[PDB]
Amino acid sequence: NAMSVVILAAGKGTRMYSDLPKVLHTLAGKAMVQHVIDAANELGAAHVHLVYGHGGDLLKQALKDDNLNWVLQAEQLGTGHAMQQAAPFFADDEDILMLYGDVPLISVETLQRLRDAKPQGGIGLLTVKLDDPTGYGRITRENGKVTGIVEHKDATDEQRQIQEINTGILIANGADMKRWLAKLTNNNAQGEYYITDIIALAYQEGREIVAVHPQRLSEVEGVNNRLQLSRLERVYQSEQAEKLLLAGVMLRDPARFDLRGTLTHGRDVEIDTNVIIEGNVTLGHRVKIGTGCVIKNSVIGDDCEISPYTVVEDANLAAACTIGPFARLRPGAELLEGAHVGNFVEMKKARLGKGSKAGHLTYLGDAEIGDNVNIGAGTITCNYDGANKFKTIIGDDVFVGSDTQLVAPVTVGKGATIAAGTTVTRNVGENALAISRVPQTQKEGWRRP
Amino acid sequence: NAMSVVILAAGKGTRMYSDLPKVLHTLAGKAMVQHVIDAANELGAAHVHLVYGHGGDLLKQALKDDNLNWVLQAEQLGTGHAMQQAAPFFADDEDILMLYGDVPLISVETLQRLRDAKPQGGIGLLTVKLDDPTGYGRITRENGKVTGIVEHKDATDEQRQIQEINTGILIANGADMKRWLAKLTNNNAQGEYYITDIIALAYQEGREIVAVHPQRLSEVEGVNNRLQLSRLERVYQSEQAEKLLLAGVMLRDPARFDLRGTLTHGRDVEIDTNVIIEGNVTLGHRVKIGTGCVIKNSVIGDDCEISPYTVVEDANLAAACTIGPFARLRPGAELLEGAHVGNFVEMKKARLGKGSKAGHLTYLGDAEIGDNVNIGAGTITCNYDGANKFKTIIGDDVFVGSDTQLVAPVTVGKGATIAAGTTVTRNVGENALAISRVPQTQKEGWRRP
Amino acid sequence: NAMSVVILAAGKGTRMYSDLPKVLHTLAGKAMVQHVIDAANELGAAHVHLVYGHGGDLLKQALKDDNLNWVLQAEQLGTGHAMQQAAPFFADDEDILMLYGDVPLISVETLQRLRDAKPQGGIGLLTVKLDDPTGYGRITRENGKVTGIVEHKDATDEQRQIQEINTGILIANGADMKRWLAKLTNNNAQGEYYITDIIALAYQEGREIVAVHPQRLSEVEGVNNRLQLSRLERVYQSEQAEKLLLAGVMLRDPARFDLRGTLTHGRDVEIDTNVIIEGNVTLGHRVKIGTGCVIKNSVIGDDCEISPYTVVEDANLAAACTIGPFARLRPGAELLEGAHVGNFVEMKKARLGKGSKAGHLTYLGDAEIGDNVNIGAGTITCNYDGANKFKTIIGDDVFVGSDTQLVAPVTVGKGATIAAGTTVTRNVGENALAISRVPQTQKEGWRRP
Ligand SMILES: CCNC(=O)CCNC(=O)[C@H](O)C(C)(C)COP(=O)(O)OP(=O)(O)OC[C@H]1O[C@@H](n2cnc3c(N)ncnc32)[C@H](O)[C@@H]1OP(=O)(O)O
Ligand SMILES: CCNC(=O)CCNC(=O)[C@H](O)C(C)(C)COP(=O)(O)OP(=O)(O)OC[C@H]1O[C@@H](n2cnc3c(N)ncnc32)[C@H](O)[C@@H]1OP(=O)(O)O
Ligand SMILES: CCNC(=O)CCNC(=O)[C@H](O)C(C)(C)COP(=O)(O)OP(=O)(O)OC[C@H]1O[C@@H](n2cnc3c(N)ncnc32)[C@H](O)[C@@H]1OP(=O)(O)O
Ligand SMILES: CC(=O)N[C@H]1[C@@H](OP(=O)(O)OP(=O)(O)OC[C@H]2O[C@@H](n3ccc(=O)[nH]c3=O)[C@H](O)[C@@H]2O)O[C@H](CO)[C@@H](O)[C@@H]1O
Ligand SMILES: CC(=O)N[C@H]1[C@@H](OP(=O)(O)OP(=O)(O)OC[C@H]2O[C@@H](n3ccc(=O)[nH]c3=O)[C@H](O)[C@@H]2O)O[C@H](CO)[C@@H](O)[C@@H]1O
Ligand SMILES: CC(=O)N[C@H]1[C@@H](OP(=O)(O)OP(=O)(O)OC[C@H]2O[C@@H](n3ccc(=O)[nH]c3=O)[C@H](O)[C@@H]2O)O[C@H](CO)[C@@H](O)[C@@H]1O
Ligand SMILES: CC(=O)N[C@H]1[C@@H](OP(=O)(O)O)O[C@H](CO)[C@@H](O)[C@@H]1O
Ligand SMILES: CC(=O)N[C@H]1[C@@H](OP(=O)(O)O)O[C@H](CO)[C@@H](O)[C@@H]1O
Ligand SMILES: CC(=O)N[C@H]1[C@@H](OP(=O)(O)O)O[C@H](CO)[C@@H](O)[C@@H]1O
Ligand SMILES: [Co+2]
């Protein structure tokens, strides 16, 4: 069935004390509004109308969904007024689902439920019963049938007794939406245009309004300040962790795990406490991740073991690799089968071959290292002359002495050996020994200052 | 109005199993007793009388508040006995507020509330209703008026039914305090001098006692063991995090944030999980702090970005600086505008100029580095001859090759260049190339052991 | 009294989605089944019969308890059927305690309680009252006496009202167990052999069954998926932390502490957030551990201070040592009194003498360093020629310049000095200066690319 979504976000987020539009504040790696848009498309929305008031520049820059139709609302004269701005773009024969830009946890399952309950020619309303319904629109019923909504400011004490409140989410036919929206007046407490008035307008037109409730309260919770955002952050993370656990992923402590993106995985993956996954991460079978690790946009093959406190970004590790602790892999880092990177080791645009080892205090940038190569501690690749960056190539079976510096561009033949403390400025022949050492001398009875 | 405070802390903290006085155990960066003293001064206390029994040496060494009058209590013959020791120092025309040295969360707001309720010539008592009032003094009332307090050991079963218990906090006039304190006898269960007896003494003298309740239970919670201390630690941290969130500071996870000191901040500051702030920290606008960072007594300018797992102490970062991950800044570290420090890099008493970069495996100590300077990986400043430490100076536009060691004292002119693997023992001219390299040689068909 | 235990674990752990037997999944550092076995032996079990179905190869490899008698159960025809397999190995005059391999938190105290309640010739049954007893065996009583157990599938609606359910744990006499087990039929809902039928069989034989309840629900909780495992992980950790706090160990945040092994300690030990202890760890008096530290199978002497993010394994630190932050100690690391290891420093099979300092960017492997020695930053020990590893020896009062590489095997006499950037390939005399430096030269007006 034809369906379109409208997201209102033209309200001012004052209690955020931010120079960034409220709906742009991230939650689990993405803008709150982006969460709403995803649910919209995920539900099958044809067009997603976004109503904004200011910061539209940062908005258009942060959001780039193909089916995103921008609707301006200069003045915030009420949710009804806002809906009237987008009304013109409602297809007569399509359904219109209204959503809030600051309610990120709304689920597709519940939205799909609201769609089904929506009577033909009627309205699908999402409501919830709170212990304290203070400050929210009150749902009124006649013989069990929803006949309208009364705002807190307009409701009488007796009416404020009603605990079934309006979440704001509702769905109706485009043509119907337009007919009602046109009849909205601002003769009420707030003195604004209530989108909630359409509920009565539909009831008196003989249309019926059905109410549906969400799975969890957190689903329809709105964010006005940072403390509320942090709260929903925990809910999201807890649900994610929980899904991963039930999905076969072992988390040492779910309360101490954060997923800010997407995580593909194999069987028996084990993740210790305080680990953060960002962007798209792929984990093979039996992957072990120590505590405090940070993995972003990376691929990790089977049986890999990531030791504690290792930062990885845009890297690709083949099977059976072991890196860390205290390893830092930067964009372009590649490790072939059984490769090993020790502590205090950094890799940027570098490839370590099969079984190759970069054990300690080393920096590999812009280099291609063959298989069975051994990089001693202190080895560094000089890939920057202050203006340009150069490549370092090391063939197979190479042994690089510690504290060796390779000045790029340079190539070290296969089976070659580089003495410790060597400065390589020229290519090294295969099966040859490169060296640049001053014979050790000594001075008897040398007293220090 | 004239007011003085008395803090009792002469009791033995046996269940702490510590060689340090109980009240000296830290909470959020400071001694529990120090928390009490702060609330005292913060309330406007003229004099703060501290009653101690032992460990007075460590106490006087840990506490150094100008208005701290030390009152000894050799024997712990009861809270009343303790108060009698300080009684002599009570000004007749001043008010006296009594507090416990092991109840760190008492708030000024509640103490200020207790002050106002205190009737002229009467007493201001702080009380709370517990689900289980077992083990605490029971508040007795006649026609709604507090007429006294009955200790648990002295109370009858029927009286132990009363749930309104004494927290210990009370305020009265100095002169009044002395008159009552003088009449204290130890004819009771414990066989000690109950400070709580003054409540009845005031009632029978025609004085009236008013009761005031605290905002939260945690406010008047006492610490006898380490488990209770940890509990209050969480309360304190949770309240702090919560204030920061509502104040505009974004915390990825409030449950995973610790503030042990003071934190000044700008707008849109973002802090990831497991971050610890110690001492006085100043954060400019839009400052980003990655997970697991530790910042102590430091200043961080606008738009700075602190990558994961970076330790900073007594450092000063100008605007737009980027340090970490895995960076360690020690006392005296200064970074000018746009400075960058990579992973596995340490700075002690060193200044990195504008736009200067210390990317990897580097140690900078006792040095002054100009602007637009580039420090290659492995570079080290030798600032210690085994007895003295020497300074290293590097002018602007300098390029330092990797694995370069500068033996201080040494100066590198502006625009100068130092070849990789160089040992600088002498000054380098401006726009000159410093070098100490052995030409690379080679030996064909070299077989390794 | 004679007692033996039987652990059933032949059930399939499907919802674990693992290639490892469910009972083998670790909890607090050890396999879930291992937890059960420990409680068995800890209670004084003579023989521990383990009933398994598959993965027996990984089981026998993971478990190696002397008194472990393996009992196979090819088909899982019910708990009763399983017990019949081990029945043959029950001593007529000994007691038999039955336990589940997936209920790791069962405590010895509660098991010892169940033993005492067990009537002579009767049965000791452990039961619990749940809010929702759905899916568990229902305990039936006649005049307050347990007369049997009815499984959920067999129980009627009315009977499912009973909230006292069977935990599975029970104890009876071997001879009695055999007599009843022989009479088990599978004429019930599940169509299996219920071990629970012995309860009725005993009742009708005139024997009496007594019921005992556990201290906590978590005690008898079973694990079928990873989410439930994580939950019990938190319970275990919380209880452990709590014991340590009450035992005098200060934990900055108990929720952020993990103990996976055994921890011996002294007085006033202080542990910051996110610290992990693995294997057997010994902590002396006044030991301080910063946040994010990982300590495994190590010994730490009095007054040691472990800075943030330091990984230690099979190391031994004498008194008053200070290591970190960002230090990595590998097997064989030893530090003598007052030794210091800075940031980005790694030690493997190395000994640092008294007062010796390895401050930065250093790697010490296979070395013996005397007292009062100073290792400058960048120093590295070359202990691997690509096939063999060699030892490095440095006598007392030695000063090693920065970025020095010692090629093993090599020995540096006492009081000797090594110039910065030196490559030591030969032994150095005592009180002598070792060097291999190229005089610094310069080239005027050198322009970079
Ligand atoms: C764990 C990390 N370890 C490392 O990084 C250490 C790497 N190893 C080295 O740097 C070693 O000193 C080397 C591989 C260069 C030598 O191996 P080793 O110490 O077992 O053998 P030697 O000391 O007897 O090697 C001497 C050879 O190297 C050459 N050599 C040694 N010092 C110098 C020098 N200053 N200039 C030119 N060649 C030299 C000689 O030509 C000689 O060749 P030959 O065998 O035909 O006489
Ligand atoms: C990413 C981090 N990278 C680094 O740290 C690498 C820093 N770069 C270096 O150390 C480079 O080897 C240098 C800057 C010294 C040379 O630049 P580059 O390799 O592009 O040029 P060249 O190899 O042709 O430089 C040769 C010059 O340096 C000098 N040079 C090279 N090796 C030696 C030596 N052993 N002794 C004395 N001078 C030497 C020569 O006097 C010569 O001068 P000229 O241009 O008048 O003939
Ligand atoms: C904080 C970490 N710091 C470090 O690692 C720095 C360690 N210090 C060094 O490497 C120093 O350069 C040294 C210990 C070698 C020299 O000490 P300092 O700079 O105060 O004294 P000098 O520069 O005047 O030392 C010169 C002596 O060393 C020797 N020396 C200096 N350069 C060389 C060289 N290229 N070849 C041989 N010997 C040399 C000379 O034989 C001379 O001996 P003398 O005193 O009888 O004339
Ligand atoms: C009049 C109305 O609809 N009342 C409902 C609305 O309250 P109420 O209107 O008071 O709520 P808000 O003002 O927060 O508006 C909700 C959303 O609409 C946006 N917005 C608001 C005004 C405007 O002119 N433009 C605009 O885009 C806000 O940015 C926010 O995303 O939500 C409550 C639940 O949260 C319901 O219980 C109320 O019955
Ligand atoms: C007699 C008395 O006052 N009773 C009150 C006291 O109990 P109670 O007297 O039993 O409590 P404590 O012994 O812990 O004393 C409270 C505080 O007084 C200090 N101290 C105690 C005795 C002494 O001789 N010197 C001294 O300095 C302790 O170190 C502690 O800081 O506090 C309870 C709340 O916590 C109240 O409900 C009780 O009504
Ligand atoms: C028939 C029976 O005993 N019923 C009890 C059993 O339920 P129930 O039999 O349904 O429970 P499970 O199937 O999980 O069996 C419990 C334990 O026995 C093992 N196992 C099971 C069958 C088998 O043939 N071999 C085997 O070794 C499982 O691996 C598990 O460790 O435990 C519940 C509590 O958890 C009790 O409330 C039930 O009254
Ligand atoms: C400074 C150095 O070269 N250390 C070597 C050396 O370190 P160990 O920590 O001892 O394993 O042996 C490794 C192979 O076992 C090699 O990969 C590494 O580079
Ligand atoms: C070993 C080395 O000198 N690396 C250089 C080099 O590292 P990259 O990680 O490739 O960016 O370029 C940097 C400037 O882009 C410079 O600051 C740094 O010192
Ligand atoms: C590169 C270097 O050698 N730094 C020295 C030097 O570091 P500082 O951080 O300045 O303390 O003095 C230390 C003794 O105070 C010595 O142990 C260390 O090795
Ligand atoms: Co070097």
DSSP string across A382-396: E--SSS----EEE-T
Alpha carbon of residue A142 to chain centroid: 44
- Residue whose Cα lies nearest atom 10 of ligand 8: it is A365
**What is the C-alpha separation between B18 and B394, in angstroms, rounded?**
51
Say if residues B226 and C246 touch (Cβ distance below 8 Å). Answer: yes
| A76 CB-contact burial (10 Å; exposed 0-12 / middle 13-18 / buried 19+) | middle
Query: Which residue in chain A has the smallest CA separation from C14?
Result: A248
Residue with tokens 């007046």: A185
Q: Is A182 exposed, middle or buried (0-12, 13-18, 19+ CB in 10 A)?
A: exposed
CA C11 to chain centre: 24
Q: Which residues line ligand 8 (CB under 6 A)?
A: A 348, 363, 365, 380, 383-384, 389; B 357, 359-360, 374, 376-377, 402
Q: Are residues B213 and B128 in contact, defined by beta-carbon separation less than 8 angstroms?
A: yes
Beta-sheet pairing, C145-150 with C138-142: antiparallel
Tell me how far apart the 2 most distant CA atoms of chain C are, in Å: 109
CA distance, residue A83 to nearest chain B CA (Å): 30
Q: CA A294 to CA C224: how far, in whole Å?
A: 30
Homologous superfamily of A225-449: Hexapeptide repeat proteins (2.160.10.10)
Pairwise CA distance, residues A234 & B236, whole Å: 20
Task: Ligand 9 pocket test: pick from B330, B384, B403 the residue with the most ligand atoms within 8 Å of its Cβ.
Answer: B384
Task: Determine the Cα–Cα distance for residues A61 and A75; give it in Å rounded to an integer.
Answer: 22
Residue A310 phi/psi, 5° resolution? -125, 135
Name the residues of A annotated as catalytic: 360
Cβ contacts of B423 on chain A, cutoff 8 Å: none
CA of B207 to the centre of ligand 5 (A): 24
Q: Which letter, b or e, does each residue of C18-55 get, where b requires 16 or more Cβ atoms within 10 Å of its Cβ?
A: bebbbbbbbbbbebbbbbbbebbbebebebbbbbbbeb
Which is the CATH superfamily of the domain at B1-224?
Spore Coat Polysaccharide Biosynthesis Protein SpsA; Chain A (3.90.550.10)
Question: Which subunits have 3 or more CB–CB pairs within 8 Å of chain C?
Answer: A, B
Residues with CB under 6 A from ligand 6: C 8-11, 51, 73, 76-79, 81-82, 100-102, 136-137, 149, 151, 165-168, 194-196, 222
Q: What is the dihedral of CA A336, A339, A344, A345, to 10 degrees?
A: -30
B187 C-beta neighbours (distance < 10 Å), count: 5
Q: Å resolution of this model?
A: 2.5
Interface test mutation site (partner A, options B240, B287, B403, max chain A beta carbons within 10 A): B403
Two tokens, residue C283: 């902590």
Tokens of A229: 């955002």
Residues of C in contact with A387 (CB under 8 A): 448-449
Are the C-beta atoms of A402 and C405 separated by less than 8 Å? yes
C289 to chain B nearest CA, in Å?
Answer: 14
C234 CB under 6 A from ligand 3?
A: no
Contact A246 C230 (CB under 8 A): no
**Closest Cα to residue C385, out of A324, A425, B447?**
B447
> HEC states along B416-429?
CEECCCCEECCCEC
Residues in A closer than 8 angstroms to C363, CB to CB, are 360-361, 377-378, 402
3-state DSSP percent of chain B in helix, strand and coil, to 5: 20, 35, 45
Assess whether the previous peptide bond of A409 is cis (omega < 30° from 0): yes
The reply to whether residue B429 touches residue C444, judged by beta carbons under 8 angstroms, is: yes
Residue of A344, A357, A379, A398 best suited for mutating to test ligand 7, as the one with most atoms within 8 Å of CB: A357
Nearest beta carbon to residue B440 from set A230, A362, A426: A426
Q: Which residues contact A8 (CB under 8 A, 6 or more apart)?
A: A51, A73, A79, A82, A83, A98, A99, A100, A101
Instruction: Tell me, using a 6 A CB cutoff, whether residue B149 lines ligand 5.
Output: yes
> What residues are paired with C348 via a beta bridge?
C365
Which residue has tokens 């726009």? B431
Chains that touch A (3 or more CB pairs under 8 A): B, C
Residue C172's closest CA among C50, C1, C42, C9? C1
The atom of ligand 9 lying closest to the CA of B330 is: 9
CB A412 within 8 A of CB A404: no
- What is the DSSP secondary structure assignment for residue B268, as one 8-state letter? S
Residue A88: DSSP 8-state: G
- Tell me if C150 sits within 8 A of C137, measured CB to CB: yes
Contacts of A20 in chain B (CB under 8 A): 268
| Kind of pairing between the strands at B410-412 and A30-31 | unpaired
Ligand (nearest to CA of C77): 6
Cα separation, A44 vs A52, whole angstroms: 22
- Both tokens assigned to C45: 């079990």
B284-309 CB burial, b ≥16 within 10 A, e <16: bebbbbbbbbbbbbbbbbbbbbbbbb
Q: Give the Cα separation of A437 and C436 in Å (integer).
A: 8
* Known binding residues of C: 8-11, 22, 73, 78-79, 100-102, 137, 151, 166, 224, 330, 348, 363, 374, 377, 383-384, 402, 420, 437
Q: How far is CA C256 from the centre of its chain?
A: 17
Instruction: Tell me which chain C residue has its CA closest to the CA of residue A253.
Output: C230
Residue B204 and residue C261: Cα distance in Å, rounded?
Answer: 62
Name the amino acid, one letter, at A202: A
Q: Tokens 């307009």 map to which residue?
A: A154
Please list every residue in chain B whose beta carbon sits closer than 8 Å to the beta carbon of residue A227. Answer: 242, 245-246, 254
| Angle, CA of C65, C71 and C75, to the nearest 5° | 140
- Is the distance from the beta carbon of residue A402 to the nearest atom of ligand 1 less than 6 Å? yes
Which of A250, A292, A386 comes nearest C292 by C-beta? A292
CA distance A78 to A72: 13
User: Residue ranges of the domains in chain A?
Assistant: 1-224, 225-449
